[PDB]
Amino acid sequence: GRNVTIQLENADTGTLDTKSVVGLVMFSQFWYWFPLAHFLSLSFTPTTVIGIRGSDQAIPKFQMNCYAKEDAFSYPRMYEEASGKEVEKVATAVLSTTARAKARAKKTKKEKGEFYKNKYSSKPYKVDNMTRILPQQSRYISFIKDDRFVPVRKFKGNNGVVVLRDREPKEPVALIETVRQMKD
Amino acid sequence: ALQLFKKLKEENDEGLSAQIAFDLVSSASQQLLEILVTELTAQGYDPALLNILSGLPTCDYYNTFLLNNKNIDIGLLNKSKSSLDGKFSLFHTAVSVANGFMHAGTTDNSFIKANLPW
Amino acid sequence: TGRDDTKETVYISSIALLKMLKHGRAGVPMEVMGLMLGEFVDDYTVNVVDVFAMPQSGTGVSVEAVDDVFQAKMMDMLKQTGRDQMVVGWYHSHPGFGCWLSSVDVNTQKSFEQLNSRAVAVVVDPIQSVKGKVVIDAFRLIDTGALINNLEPRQTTSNTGLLNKANIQALIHGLNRHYYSLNIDYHKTAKETKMLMNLHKEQWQSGLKMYDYEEKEESNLAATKSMVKIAEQYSKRIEEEKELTEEELKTRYVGRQDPKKHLSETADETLENNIVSVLTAGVNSVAIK
């Protein structure tokens, strides 16, 4: 659902993500037995910055300033697909024929009678925690120092779970529970 | 690895120790993860750290992410019906592979239920 | 739910292949028939180790041309020699047609199906092969029932396969009636490859044989004279040739059937040979005496 990206290696330690590689070799081979195709699944890795409020293991809702250009990291659309295309195409075919069958006669007598990268603009915009966040966009993210939620040590500048210390526990924080809690 | 966690036994703030735990699991090999948890158990290290290094926290966290933020096309359902035939072995497979990747990491049964004849 | 109904990749050994081109091609126009001897392993790997020609018959190929009397008799001879292995199918040759089964050859297939359910029917067209190995295909029955209830997809589950496409009438007849085709593959050992090329001592003995010197003279004379003729034409090529549009140039200066290029080719062949000729003669003279 447009939320995963495939990681080649761990970029933080400069060392192979093992699980991914084994996925890809097994994926290539599929001429022989098509269900080898499913091993592409294991290479998917999700990408998001996820704050963790204390050691409670709950996700705070808070936001971070991101100096970037919005258009760049607009959340990719819902596609048209083939179904949407048929409807839209056939609508155009109708109109197009009709048009010219009337326009030609009417007109005569009418009168007579880039930067792959655009940085992220210096403009700030707030990005919610635990949303789909591109690798490039993650760089600009900086935790708000006024705000209660600050990482124990400075932000990686990359997607992944980063644990925050909460200055005030007194002040209720809006929370999104983990899934295990929902089922009970 | 063990020695690092002996340093933070003394410098034990659970916010700091946990953070370092997340970084480690993303990076390191499963084989390492196994050997480390046995050793730390006998260290009698903090059982908070032990939980992360199992990898179960991270799993839940990513499931909530995928539920909330999935964006699905309705056009896959219809495309599958129209062009492709779920009887033919090649054609039936391609759809399963594309759909499987689509709804990944989250239970989804909308597709199953709708393309139930297919 | 039910059966895959899978069709074997028919693994044809080189020895079997060579007897098929020999007996069939030579025997044109009269058709020839015979059994295939092999071993069946897996559910997709049939190794056809050997073939033989069953004694000719004037009914050519028919249900009754083939016989158990012939089958048994031949088997018994090979039985003693310990080279006996189970019948994995039957071949016959169509020298006048492409690869497909007559209405009759299906009936013939049907008796061998009852014998062994992995029985193949292989139609060999050898005269209208220009590489030998091409236009020979292996087949297996599919029931009349199978076509109705749609059991053609199952057989090729999870495999790219080859479904043959030559002959449009005769093929589509075969594809939707006579039989289902899947890929046919040739395998051989690297002991045998050595035998097929054949090493000889006369490959190298011919390299120290010094052919007569009348023949060196002729080559010297000839090659040089020839390039004198196309060297006039070359002068013509480059007289102007620098005005626009490349196509225009190639018709006017006759750069079609290129004279520059032909000069180079004649030059290279002779140049190469005259160097072999000095090289052999020098080796011969000291080495002997």
Swiss-Prot record, chain B:
The organism named in the record is: Saccharomyces cerevisiae (strain ATCC 204508 / S288c) (Baker's yeast)
Spell out the protein name for this chain.
26S proteasome regulatory subunit RPN2
Q: Which residues form the signal peptide?
A: none
Q: What else is known?
A: Present with 4750 molecules/cell in log phase SD medium.
Per UniProt, subunit arrangement is: Interacts with UBR1.
Residue range from the parent sequence: 238 to 355 of 945
PTM statement from Swiss-Prot or TrEMBL: N-acetylated by NAT1.
Q: Which family does it belong to?
A: Belongs to the proteasome subunit S1 family.
Q: What does this protein do?
A: Acts as a regulatory subunit of the 26S proteasome which is involved in the ATP-dependent degradation of ubiquitinated proteins.
UniProtKB/Swiss-Prot annotation, chain C:
Task: Supply one GO BP term.
Answer: proteasome storage granule assembly
- Known post-translational modifications? N-acetylated by NAT3.
What cellular component terms from Gene Ontology apply here? cytosol; mitochondrion; nucleus; proteasome complex; proteasome regulatory particle, lid subcomplex; proteasome storage granule
> Per the database record, which ranges form the MPN domain?
10-145
Keyword vocabulary terms for this entry? Acetylation, Hydrolase, Metal-binding, Metalloprotease, Protease, Proteasome, Thiol protease, Ubl conjugation pathway, Zinc
The record's similarity note reads: Belongs to the peptidase M67A family.
Protein name as catalogued: Ubiquitin carboxyl-terminal hydrolase RPN11
Task: Please report the organism this UniProt entry assigns to the protein.
Answer: Saccharomyces cerevisiae (strain ATCC 204508 / S288c) (Baker's yeast)
Query: Gene for this protein?
Result: RPN11
